[PDB]
Design a binder for this molecule. Structure first.
Ligand SMILES: *[C@@H]1O[C@H](CO)[C@@H](O[C@@H]2O[C@H](CO)[C@@H](O)[C@H](O)[C@H]2NC(C)=O)[C@H](O)[C@H]1NC(C)=O
Ligand SMILES: *[C@@H]1O[C@H](CO)[C@@H](O)[C@H](O)[C@H]1NC(C)=O
Ligand SMILES: *[C@@H]1O[C@H](CO)[C@@H](O)[C@H](O)[C@H]1NC(C)=O
Ligand SMILES: *[C@@H]1O[C@H](CO)[C@@H](O)[C@H](O)[C@H]1NC(C)=O
Ligand SMILES: N[C@@H](CCC(=O)O)C(=O)O
Ligand SMILES: N[C@@H](CCC(=O)O)C(=O)O
Lengths: 264, 269, 399, 276, 49
């Protein structure tokens, strides 16, 4: 905040308001120039460093007039600082399939899926959506396992796959998330050839496992393993809060010799 | 499936939530070292350890406590640097601590269908109430694996879905057990969507609907393909929006009334 | 049917070399020869009327450029071809006008079209806030009232048990108390000042919270109005001469020339051979405004480039006409055409068709020093105004 | 508007100059809401009538203006036998030979374009929804408004019961009670009055912990007001078509429409909105 | 939001021969700037703030 221009200005400002008060006190109808530095900075940083107030009737109006800029500067600093932490909430957040971003071809983010999947059968039937994958046909990975790794290095940004596989990845890696809502509902299923003598018993056993709670044990044990699920800032930014005052701790040790130089 | 929908229930959290515990407690040790360097400075020119905390800690909380001051010229530059971040720390504290203070809590009442509170409703407090409507599938399933339950909800058996919803706001019964698809439609329909299912829509036996046919009937083969074909053409995906669309979204009051300020008094405790 | 490549409504692409024919979800079209694939917005509608009425069509992308203009005897483009019995319908981006509607006929329009002006984004500005937008000048005179009448009350109870020292502490407490103080030992006033002190705590609420948002550049700094503005009416005027322009040999140029003489004469040296190249001729600073249709311009402006291209007046259109499809002036197909078109507007067919082909994307700053430099202006004003009173007072005392 | 006493039109000068153009007009008197009456002169003028005068002098017209008999725009329906589907109102009047031109707000519609022909439109328009503004309320009385009286009583007595402990702790230390109570009330109030500090080491700790209580309360108290003076979260907008409330009325958002008219035809045109 | 984009119009009977000029003259009023004067004088002049 305040960029650079005001900060070399206020330092120049605090410098100039220091000198003229002494000049406005020497030729007056009883302090010294030493009070100038302490009074000038003392009002600013809400400190009790200063010793006393001027004893006159000409610089009295200066102190009050000076008190305003102490209030305004500290008012503006806190005013804009909280605005960035709260109000500023910009994000793109591509949402839904109905968004036109999917309809029009996109070069920044490409569209890809796993080759020879059910989605390939899906997109190749409806002539309405035979508009982009007739172009992104060149992007079709050979395995859903390695495609997730491609997104990890920010190579890929759009991927069409079953929600069961995709969501569980967000539970393991703590840096991936989904968006939107489902748009093609179809369950899995044991498959076999026609007229196989097991087309009647095995379907009944699957249903009987649903009621007896067996699928509760299997889903919880494998899928739902659970992991990690923001005014909590850390050393990424405020580690620089308290090293300049720490730096100033070791920045005044040589000033003692500068200070003690007046002894001799 | 089978779901449970109950009435919405009516918070110390962290009164010091801004920043974090790890990056904060480490600050206190720094107050020791910064005061120590003043002792070496104050040794030259014209007790100190004890007064330093009063000389220093009284500055971070503005300045109201009577605070002394070391003499000299080079012995006062350091605190001027300290005073700079004295206003910096307070400004960060007052960025959005009010919004985080009034943060609500998504309370819960029941762990799930197999929650242990359901097994022994008479084991704690005034007895819990939960009921179904018999002559069906949900009643049949609940009587094949939880036979201990069935001796209890026979007390309450409503005339239908409509009457049960009205009686739920009263207080006589505080739960419901019925078909999942029907209950979701009611829940996402009422005034202010106060009525919410347990655990934000958890099902317990995923069995679909269907069209019963005569045994061995030859219409089964081709009728299955027709239904399957519509799923790949996005028919019921938009058809459900014409009949099964909710009204609410399952997501001032400038008051404090203790709330989390008890922790502040708990500190003084 | 004779059409032409118009960016939002007609898109022309080559056929797929692998298949050797036009890709699906399109219609064949020939030049005048190489086969091409054409699709867009106007093409989609043409399928419906053909299905609803029933005929055979073959697109005839016109070699002659532009849409139509009288050349003192002859007419080229879509209108000219229809005017010479070589084409029944000319579907596309055709603007209904007065002269054209004489020799041919038009159907019922289905899209608005006018005239609009586009200028790049302008840097916002914040005027020096008068006391940082507080509680009206009344409060500033108000605070002087009670403060000066409450100090006397303390002075009255001081003697009973230094007014000059009684104004330093009483006032300065209100503004982030840090100045040196001098407090009396009177019990009665000791309780009193605390009640006064508590007022300063509540005072900050007035000067905090609210002041955060209302400090950034505002007023939108948008200036120079539309065709009614005298900035256009005067060619040279103050500042460097204005930098508008338009595409010649169309509909907008003819409307501006006949209706507004002495204007089309000047911008003859400010022309753009095409549309896409014209936009690049605007951003860097070699041109400022554009004068074109309200359908092509609106689509691209909504699409925008970095959210910095807007239309002055937020879309104040002029000379509102519509689109349509030409006929043979005796084609006797009018009744089945317009009646068919009105049905789609009655239903939601055209409402969502615009979504599939017309949809934009977009439509908190550093505070710097220039916007809020007025707070410093208080210091300099109070600095000089103080010197005259203080310095001259002792000169009289000197004598 | 009704005419003058003698049967003439007034001269209402516009703010910019010449008075508006007015033409005489005949029509019903008491709107005939089951009580028909005679026909009396009126004053018909405005934007649409101003257009008619422009057309009159460019192709040699000679006009006379008379309003509709009932008030309804026009709609085709059957009367008294369920087998007499016919027009009504202004639209019926035009086809009955009683008029030859229509100058009024008329919406081009396919369902009524078969029996008449329409010129090019004056303007272009749509359909929107008008709802009364919600009342904004601001209880800015201050005087410790956001803080309830529940916390006020204990915090007010908190300082009194904690200041006394300082003098109590001074008894066994290895400044009277009144001279020590001013410290604690001073700390909270951010006051400039301060003198006297605890002498015993442990008494400073009591004074130490009290310092933190000052910072948390007043700073956070002047953070709750931050949301109070802006707030601004009104959400009562239907937001166009396909609102869930519009799809299924809840007997609370009661909406009306003009009988006959055209929007009634549009709703009957489609089927997905046959429930309300 | 707008959800029915249909304009106004002048209506008469099919047999009427007045069509050619009435439709042609309306389109000339748009291009001549006349319709802006009527719009600014009889529709959008008042302010409320
Ligand atoms: C429509 O306007 C045209 C243009 O003036 C009219 O055509 C002329 O009409 C006048 C009088 O009716 C004749 O004297 C002329 O001979 C016509 N031709 C020309 C070239 O001027 C036409 O009559 C108008 N239509 C109607 C129904 O009045
Ligand atoms: C199907 O299940 C029944 C259940 O007992 C069994 O008797 C029958 O043999 C089974 N049929 C096959 C083909 O396994
Ligand atoms: C269900 O069946 C019982 C008999 O077992 C009968 O008394 C009752 O009327 C039926 N209906 C309901 C809603 O319980
Ligand atoms: C109207 O008629 C009169 C005489 O009947 C004559 O001025 C002319 O024919 C017409 N005026 C026009 C066309 O301006
Ligand atoms: N959907 C259930 C309702 C009956 C029940 O409550 O079990 C069924 O048809 O079986
Ligand atoms: N296409 C419109 C506007 C002119 C142009 O695009 O050049 C017309 O045919 O009049």
């Amino acid at each position: 905040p305040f960029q650079s221009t005001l900060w070399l200005l206020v330092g120049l400002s605090v410098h100039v308001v220091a000198v003229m008060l002494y000049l406005l006190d020497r030729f007056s109808p009883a302090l010294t120039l030493s009070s100038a530095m302490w009074f000038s900075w003392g009002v600013l940083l809400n400190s009790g460093i200063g010793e006393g107030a001027p004893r006159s009737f000409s610089a009295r109006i200066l102190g009050m007039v000076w008190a305003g800029f102490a209030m305004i500067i500290v008012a503006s600093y806190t005013a804009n600082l909280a605005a960035f932490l709260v109000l500023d909430r910009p994000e793109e957040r591509i949402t839904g399939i109905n968004d036109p971003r999917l309809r029009n071809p996109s070069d920044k983010f490409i569209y890809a899926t796993v080759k020879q999947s059910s989605v390939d059968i899906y997109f190749r039937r409806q002539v309405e959506l035979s508009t982009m994958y007739r172009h992104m046909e060149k992007h079709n990975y050979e395995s859903a396992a390695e495609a997730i790794q491609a997104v990890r290095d920010n190579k890929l940004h759009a991927f069409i796959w079953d929600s069961a596989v995709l969501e569980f990845e967000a539970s393991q890696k703590c840096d991936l998330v989904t968006t939107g809502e489902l748009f093609f509902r179809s369950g899995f299923g044991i498959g076999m050839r026609k007229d196989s003598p097991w087309k009647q018993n095995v379907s009944l056993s699957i249903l009987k496992s649903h009621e007896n709670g067996f699928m509760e044990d299997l889903d919880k044990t494998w899928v739902r393993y659970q992991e990690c699920d923001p005014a909590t800032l850390t050393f990424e930014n405020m580690a620089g809060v308290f090293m300049l005052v720490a730096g100033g701790i070791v920045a005044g040790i040589f000033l003692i010799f500068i200070e003690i130089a007046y002894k001799r | 499936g089978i779901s449970v929908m109950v009435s919405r229930s009516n918070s110390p959290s962290a009164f010091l939530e801004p920043f974090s515990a790890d990056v904060w407690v480490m600050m206190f040790v720094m107050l020791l070292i910064v005061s120590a360097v003043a002792v070496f400075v104050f040794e030259y020119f014209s007790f100190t350890i004890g007064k330093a905390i009063w000389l220093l800690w009284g500055l971070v909380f503005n300045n109201s406590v009577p605070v002394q001051n070391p003499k000299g010229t080079t012995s006062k530059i350091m605190v001027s640097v300290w005073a700079f971040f004295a206003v910096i720390f307070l400004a960060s504290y007052t960025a959005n601590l009010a919004a985080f203070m009034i943060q609500e809590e998504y309370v819960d009442q029941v762990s799930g269908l197999s929650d242990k509170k359901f097994q022994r409703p008479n084991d704690f407090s005034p007895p819990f109430r939960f009921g179904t409507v018999p002559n069906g599938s949900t009643e049949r399933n609940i009587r094949n694996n939880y036979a201990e339950m069935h001796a209890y909800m026979g007390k309450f058996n409503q005339r239908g879905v409509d009457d049960a919803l009205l009686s739920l706001k009263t207080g006589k019964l505080d739960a419901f057990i019925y078909d999942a698809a029907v209950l979701n439609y009611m829940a996402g329909r009422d005034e202010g969507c106060k009525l919410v299912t347990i655990g934000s829509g958890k099902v317990f036996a995923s069995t679909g609907y269907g069209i019963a046919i005569q045994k061995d009937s030859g219409w089964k083969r081709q009728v299955d393909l027709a239904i399957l074909q519509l799923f790949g053409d996005g028919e019921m995906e938009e058809l459900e929006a014409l009949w099964l669309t909710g009204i609410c979204h399952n997501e001032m009051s400038s008051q404090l009334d203790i709330d989390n300020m008890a922790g502040v008094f708990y500190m003084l405790g | 049917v004779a059409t032409l490549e118009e960016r939002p409504f007609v898109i022309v692409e080559p056929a797929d070399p692998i298949s050797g024919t036009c890709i699906r979800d399109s219609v064949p079209c020939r030049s005048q020869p190489e086969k091409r694939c054409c699709k867009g917005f106007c093409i989609d509608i043409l399928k419906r009327l053909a299905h609803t009425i029933g005929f055979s069509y073959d697109l005839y992308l016109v070699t002659n450029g532009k849409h139509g203009k009288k050349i003192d005897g002859v007419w080229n483009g879509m209108i000219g071809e229809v005017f010479y019995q070589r084409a029944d319908m000319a579907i596309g981006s055709l603007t209904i006008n007065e002269e054209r509607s004489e020799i041919v006929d038009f159907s019922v329009p289905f899209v608005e079209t006018g005239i609009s002006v586009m200028v790049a984004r302008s840097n916002g500005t914040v005027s020096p806030s008068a006391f940082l937008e507080p509680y009206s000048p009344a409060v500033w005179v108000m605070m002087f009232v009670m403060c000066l009448t409450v100090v006397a009350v303390t002075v009255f109870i001081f003697e009973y048990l230094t007014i000059g020292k009684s104004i330093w502490l009483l006032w300065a407490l209100v503004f982030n108390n840090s100045v040196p103080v001098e407090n009396p030992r009177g019990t009665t006033s000791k309780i009193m000042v605390l009640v006064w002190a508590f007022f300063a705590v509540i005072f900050l609420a007035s000067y905090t919270a609210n002041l955060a948002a209302f400090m950034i550049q505002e007023e939108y700094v948008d200036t120079v109005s539309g065709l009614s503005d005298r900035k256009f009416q005067r060619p040279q005027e103050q500042y460097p001469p204005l930098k508008f322009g338009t595409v010649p040999n169309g509909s907008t140029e003819k409307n501006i020339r006949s209706n507004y003489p002495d204007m089309h004469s000047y911008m003859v040296r400010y022309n753009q051979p095409r549309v896409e190249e014209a936009l690049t001729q605007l951003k860097a600073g070699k041109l400022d405004a554009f004068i074109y249709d309200a359908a092509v311009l609106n689509y691209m402006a909504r699409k925008d480039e970095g959210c910095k291209l807007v239309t002055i007046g937020s879309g104040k259109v002029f000379a509102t006409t519509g689109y349509g499809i030409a006929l043979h002036k005796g084609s006797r197909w009018k009744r089945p055409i317009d009646l068919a078109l009105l049905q789609f507007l009655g239903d939601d067919e055209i409402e969502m068709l615009e979504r599939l082909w017309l949809s934009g994307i977009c439509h908190s700053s550093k505070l710097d020093i220039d916007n809020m430099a007025g707070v410093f202006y208080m210091l300099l004003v109070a600095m000089g105004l103080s010197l005259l009173v203080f310095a001259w007072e002792h000169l009289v005392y000197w004598r | 508007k009704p005419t003058l006493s003698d049967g003439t039109c007034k001269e209402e000068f516009t703010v910019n100059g010449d008075p508006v153009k007015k033409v005489i007009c005949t029509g019903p008197n008491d709107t005939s809401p089951g009580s028909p009456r005679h026909t009396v002169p009126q004053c018909c003028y405005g934007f649409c009538i101003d257009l008619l005068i422009k057309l009159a002098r460019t192709m040699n017209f000679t006009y006379e203006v008379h309003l509709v008999a009932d008030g309804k725009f026009g709609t085709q329906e059957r009367v008294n036998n369920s087998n007499k589907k016919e027009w009504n109102g202004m639209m019926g009047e035009l086809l009955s030979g009683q008029a030859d031109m229509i100058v009024a707000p008329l919406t081009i519609n396919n369902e009524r374009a078969q029996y008449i022909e329409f010129s090019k439109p004056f303007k272009y328009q749509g359909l929107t929804i008008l709802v009364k503004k919600e009342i904004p309320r601001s209880t800015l009385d201050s005087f410790m408004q956001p803080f309830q009286s529940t916390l006020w009583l204990l915090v007010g007595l908190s300082v009194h019961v904690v200041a006394v402990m300082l003098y109590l702790l001074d008894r066994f230390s290895p400044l009277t009670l009144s001279s020590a109570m001013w410290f604690s009330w001073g700390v909270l109030l951010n006051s400039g009055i301060g003198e006297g500090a605890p002498r015993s080491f442990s008494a400073r700790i009591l004074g130490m912990v009290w310092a933190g209580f000052a910072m948390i309360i007043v700073a956070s108290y002047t953070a709750n007001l931050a949301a109070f003076l802006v707030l601004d979260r009104p959400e009562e907008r239907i937001t166009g078509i396909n609102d869930p409330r519009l799809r299924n009325p809840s007997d609370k958002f009661i909406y009306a429409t003009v009988k006959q008219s055209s929007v009634d035809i549009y709703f009957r045109r489609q089927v997905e909105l046959s429930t309300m």
